[PDB]
């Protein structure tokens, strides 16, 4: 459930990690890792 | 160096002090006020004063006596 | 800083005699350039003797 009111319904790793707000800097690093994996090759986002 | 006019404060809160000229001024002002209050009640043609008490009793008195006038007033 | 004039001017002193001493240091700086600490110390000592 987005802050904008929309609903993202998926099992893709990158989307799930992208629509989540975190405060711990290590969690931010992990989110950035998910985005990097998605952008570089597009697959294996959950595995990484 | 006066007791009140010194860089270090030597008194409790609210404790005042008045040096020579100020003390003389206050004493003379008080004495003159009292004398002007009681006078005009002097001599065969003196007039009376009305004393309205501020207390709950609100007692009313009219008098020509200096002692009675001075006794029933708030003096500071 | 160690400059007497700079020290005196930098800090607000709020008292008339203190301000006159500050401007004394300024004047000594203008005419001489150094000795700004000595002149203020001398004025203070002179007034200290004036007390007694």
């Amino acid at each position: 459930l987005d802050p904008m009111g929309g609903i993202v319904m998926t099992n893709d790793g990158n989307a799930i990690l992208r629509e989540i707000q975190v405060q711990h800097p290590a969690a931010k690093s992990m989110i950035e890792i998910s985005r990097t994996q998605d952008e570089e090759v597009g697959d294996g986002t959950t595995s990484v | 160096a006066s007791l009140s006019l010194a860089p270090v404060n030597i008194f409790k809160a609210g404790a005042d002090e008045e040096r020579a000229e100020t003390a003389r001024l206050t004493s003379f002002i008080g004495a003159i006020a009292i004398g002007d209050l009681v006078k005009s009640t002097l001599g065969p043609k003196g007039m009376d004063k009305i004393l309205l008490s501020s207390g709950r009793d609100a007692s009313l008195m009219v008098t020509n006596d200096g002692a009675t006038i001075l006794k029933n007033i708030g003096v500071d | 800083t160690n400059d007497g004039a700079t020290i005196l001017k930098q800090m607000q002193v709020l008292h008339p005699a203190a301000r006159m001493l500050v401007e004394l240091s300024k004047a000594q700086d203008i005419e001489a350039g150094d000795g700004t600490t000595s002149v203020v110390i001398i004025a203070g000592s002179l007034l200290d003797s004036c007390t007694k």
Partner: protein, 532 residues
């Protein structure tokens, strides 16, 4: 009786407060020293994350309120500016110097004597370093550069991959070499464009034998690769011509409006016609290009790039031999463009880098230039790679400019401590104590190096001091000057043979700056803080 609207701390109170502030600043960064050092994570108020080991970066990002702490932070910044390495060692040395100097002052030693002793000790330390501990790099060949780079990149995110990053750095620095007047070589680091992009591992970081632009071609129509490139560098926008503020168009005969409007764009059309007719293939301009002119560039089969950075354009023009043209005006009052103003590179391509593209101007002639593309796991890792890489580039520049290096791992500090504690017996009576405390303060670096590795700091530093003392006393044991600390095994080691070097300028500038900062803080004995 002062009647000053503000606080006032005097004497031992303010002296101890200043020492407290400096020691706190030191203890902030003391844990990021040496190969067994560890990075720090800085999180701003809005939530940005910065993972770094550089002391200058940490001290710059941190909010600081005490003036002495500000002095040490600015000292680290200055050390970063003038040298580029040792930004943590300088802060640690300065804070230890203040601590020991204040301890001396508390013993009723006058601060002036302490300051004089510090000055004498600093001068003697610099002289002894320059006369005894320096190693000439002439006979060491290329291995000295690689080893200096590897030493500088230890304690960094790219520390383990030093075997590869050091070759990369040395090649990049040697690429930008140039000799100026009066016949000495100068190495203009910061002319190496460092481009970051997450993606593949660190080992896929590329050294471009050319220049790398972080931009894209203007239009999709123009080709993304040109083999024989004739670069034309321009410093003016290519748009419809708009007359200046002092000129206004007033029409009284309506028949002239069409001609006016036609010329309004025909002027730029003719300029581009000249530029393309000279034979140009690649056009880079700092100004913008509107779609009308992009159409000419597409039809001509040439690449046009807009909004190029000024420094990037200057570097491209210098490397390729082109000349920046802010206008098309010759010395006879005409619009023209000679072919001699065209730079040349043997290939200009637009490569895709992790779902993004950038122009790679490869192998420019008339000059060799270098650029570095860093690949990391995420943005934070790439930023730390860039910072450490800049540290290494600065170190290699210092080594190549001044050809003297000194052993690393606290060998210099221990040798200086021994020599200074020996030499202090001859100067004065209280500056004796000052110089002895300077020598003791110099020993904080090996202590911190050892304690960061969870080794026996006391025993290790005692062994190192014994080695250096025996080297200084015994005439024929001068080969023990290079004994430093091996933190991987926790034993003293010949650092000259181990390949642990650093430029002499780092140590010398660090000592001078630390001594001056300590003197500046120590000169204070009263603080007035006016109420805002």
């Amino acid at each position: 009786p002062l009647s000053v609207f503000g606080d006032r701390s005097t004497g031992e109170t303010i002296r101890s407060q200043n020492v407290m502030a400096a020691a706190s600043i030191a203890n902030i960064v003391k844990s990021s020293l040496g190969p067994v050092g560890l990075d720090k994570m800085l999180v701003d108020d809005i939530g940005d994350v910065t993972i770094t080991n550089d002391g200058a970066t940490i001290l710059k990002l941190l909010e600081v309120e005490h003036p002495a702490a500000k002095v040490l932070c600015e000292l680290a910044d200055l050390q970063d500016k003038e040298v580029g390495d040792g930004t943590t060692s300088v802060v640690i040395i300065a804070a230890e110097l203040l601590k020991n100097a204040d301890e001396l002052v508390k013993q009723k030693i006058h601060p002036t004597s302490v300051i004089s002793g510090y000055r004498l000790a600093c001068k003697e330390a610099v002289r002894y370093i320059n006369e005894n501990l320096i190693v000439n790099t002439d006979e060491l060949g290329r291995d000295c550069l690689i080893n200096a780079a590897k030493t500088s990149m230890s304690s960094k995110i790219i520390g383990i991959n030093g075997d590869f990053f050091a070759n990369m750095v040395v090649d990049a620095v040697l690429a930008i070499k140039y000799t100026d007047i009066r016949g000495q070589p100068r190495y203009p680091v910061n002319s190496v464009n460092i481009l970051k992009a997450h993606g593949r591992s660190q080992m896929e970081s590329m050294l471009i034998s050319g220049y790398a632009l972080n931009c894209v071609v203007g239009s999709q129509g123009m080709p993304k690769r040109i083999v024989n490139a004739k670069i034309a560098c321009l410093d003016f926008s290519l748009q419809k011509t708009k007359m200046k503020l002092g000129v206004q168009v007033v029409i009284t005969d309506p028949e002239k409006l069409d001609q006016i409007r036609q010329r309004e764009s025909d002027i730029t059309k003719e300029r581009i016609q000249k530029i393309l007719a000279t034979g140009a293939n690649v056009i880079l301009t700092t100004g913008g290009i509107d779609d009308m002119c992009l159409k000419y560039f597409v039809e001509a089969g040439a690449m046009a790039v807009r909004r190029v950075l000024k420094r990037d354009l200057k570097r491209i023009a210098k490397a390729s031999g082109a000349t920046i043209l802010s206008t098309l005006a010759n010395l006879e009052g005409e619009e023209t463009f000679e072919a001699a103003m065209l730079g040349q590179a043997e290939e200009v391509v637009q490569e895709r880098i992790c779902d993004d593209e950038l122009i790679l101007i490869k192998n420019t002639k008339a000059r060799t230039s270098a650029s570095i593309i860093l690949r990391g796991a995420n943005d934070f890792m790439c930023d730390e790679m860039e910072r450490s890489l800049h540290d290494a580039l600065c170190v290699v520049k210092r080594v190549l400019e001044s050809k003297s290096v000194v052993p690393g791992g606290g060998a210099v500090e221990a040798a200086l401590s021994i020599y200074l504690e020996n030499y202090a017996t001859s100067m004065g009576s209280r500056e004796q104590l000052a110089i002895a405390e300077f020598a003791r303060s110099l020993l904080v670096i090996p202590n911190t190096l050892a304690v960061n590795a969870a080794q026996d700091s006391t025993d290790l530093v005692a062994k190192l001091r014994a080695f250096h003392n025996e080297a200084q006393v015994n005439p024929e044991r001068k080969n023990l000057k290079w004994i430093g600390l091996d933190l991987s095994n926790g034993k003293p080691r010949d650092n000259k043979q181990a390949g642990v070097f650093e430029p002499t300028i780092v140590k010398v500038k660090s000592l001078k700056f630390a001594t001056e900062a300590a003197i500046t803080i120590l000169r204070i004995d009263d603080l007035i803080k006016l109420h805002p």
